[PDB]
């Protein structure tokens, strides 16, 4: 984040000290500077690594979900009057890759909700401004089965009531991990199968645990239905704040295939170029 070191002038050298020659077998990166191999002038460095900080790298709102809801009528079976979305950053790739640069992370989160609505037909009248309810459902809490069941009382569940046309809604969340850091990767299982029990029992998905269980968001339109159908989409933008990260990893090189590290397609990411072609 802070200023880089200056460059010191270097003249000709004739000595038994050989910074150029090293041994990478040790696993240590040679900390050479230009003045070690070539003659250098004095440069008072003014560049800084301020935008390379882990905070800056993640200080952007990244779309992570597009939740679709409808306001048509209870009778219509093809219209989804409410939508439940499991909270995760793995429905999108860009933030997922930036995060999976690191094994562990710990950060507060900022959720911004951009709601856009539209008509689906013209010859059924018009609609009044809609209010959307976004109810956070932590794991274990009752999940709505209908758009107007008791669960939406939100006596305890945090809930956001957004008026259409208002600026995108926004909330902040502290670090809510049950562990001391978020696990981008979990090399293990939630169950250990025990000798004796049937192959059906004890079988758990690889890499899946309750560390990444954060509940879901239930989104509905609070208004009663107008004689015409209205389709709305809530876009969720996640911004990490106060980011700490641990154990850097090589970034994803091939397309993601599911919530894990599985790959199936695009296994040839590199193009063809001659060895002696510039």
């Amino acid at each position: 984040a802070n200023n880089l070191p200056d460059t010191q002038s270097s003249g000709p050298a004739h000595s038994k000290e050989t910074p150029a020659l090293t041994a990478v077998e040790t696993g240590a990166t040679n900390p050479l500077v230009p003045s070690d191999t070539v003659q250098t002038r004095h440069v008072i460095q003014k560049r800084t690594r301020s935008e390379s900080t882990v905070e800056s790298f993640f200080a952007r709102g990244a779309c992570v979900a597009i939740i679709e809801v409808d306001n048509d009528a209870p009778t219509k079976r093809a219209s989804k009057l409410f939508s439940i979305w499991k909270i995760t950053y793995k429905d999108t790739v860009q933030l997922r890759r930036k995060l999976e640069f690191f094994t562990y992370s710990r950060f507060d989160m900022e959720l911004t909700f951009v709601v856009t609505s539209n008509y689906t037909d013209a010859n059924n009248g018009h609609a009044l401004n809609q209010v959307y309810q976004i109810m956070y459902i932590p794991p274990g809490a009752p999940i709505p089965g209908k758009w107007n069941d008791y669960t939406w009382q939100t006596s305890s569940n945090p809930s956001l009531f957004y008026t259409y046309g208002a600026p995108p809604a926004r909330i902040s969340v502290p670090y809510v991990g049950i562990a001391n850091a978020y696990s981008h990767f979990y090399d293990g299982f939630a169950k250990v199968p025990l000798a004796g029990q049937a192959s059906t029992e004890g079988d758990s998905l690889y890499g899946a645990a309750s560390l990444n269980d954060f509940g879901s968001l239930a989104v509905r339109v609070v208004n009663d239905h107008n004689p015409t159908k209205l389709t709305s989409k809530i876009r969720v933008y996640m911004k990490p704040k106060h980011v700490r990260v641990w154990c850097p990893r090589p970034p994803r090189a091939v397309p993601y295939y599911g919530p894990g590290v599985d790959y199936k397609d695009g296994l040839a990411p590199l193009p063809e170029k001659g060895l002696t072609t510039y």
Partner: protein, 235 residues
Amino acid sequence: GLPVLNTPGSNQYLTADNYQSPCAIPEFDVTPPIDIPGEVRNMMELAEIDTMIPLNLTNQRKNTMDMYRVELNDAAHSDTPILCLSLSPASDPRLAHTMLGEILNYYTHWAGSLKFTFLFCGSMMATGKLLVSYAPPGAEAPKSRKEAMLGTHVIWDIGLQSSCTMVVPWISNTTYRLTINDSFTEGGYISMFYQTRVVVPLSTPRKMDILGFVSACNDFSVRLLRDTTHISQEA
């Protein structure tokens, strides 16, 4: 007047916000408070009170007063468990509806040691030794006293003191556990076994009952307040 810029989040209503609003009844003469007994500042104060566990949720016992009693007898010693519980204080049916479970069902994360208190409600002339065991998760749930004694446990002697407390310590990989049935944050296994057996003399009831209670310890805490699934409304 003063130049201002409206940031995003303007004109939104967040039910969790904390903003000043105009008073609709200005200059109201508020009735002063009196000292009422039983003031509560923290929900964990309620979670720290022992509440009876509906341990016996069999078909004929559930949703009666019998669901709280666990029947012991003076039969010959056996290594089979008396009762078996899963340490899911919010999602386990036998624990979800205790006061601790009821409070935990308003929160997403919990952490801390628990205490299970067992009360022996046999006659004064009954004697016995029980083994109350907690097994951290990962291994097979103990099916016999021989497995159970390898975990945390207490040997309870039933005498002049008819109650025993076993503290389940906080042994978790994560700093918090979820309040749902979850594999990565699974809690462990509570079990009870006969250490020797229950012995009674003649002219004494050969079947007795134990009552179970659970509560939190002073190191217990919750977070991420949510809506419970124990209450719902229709239409």
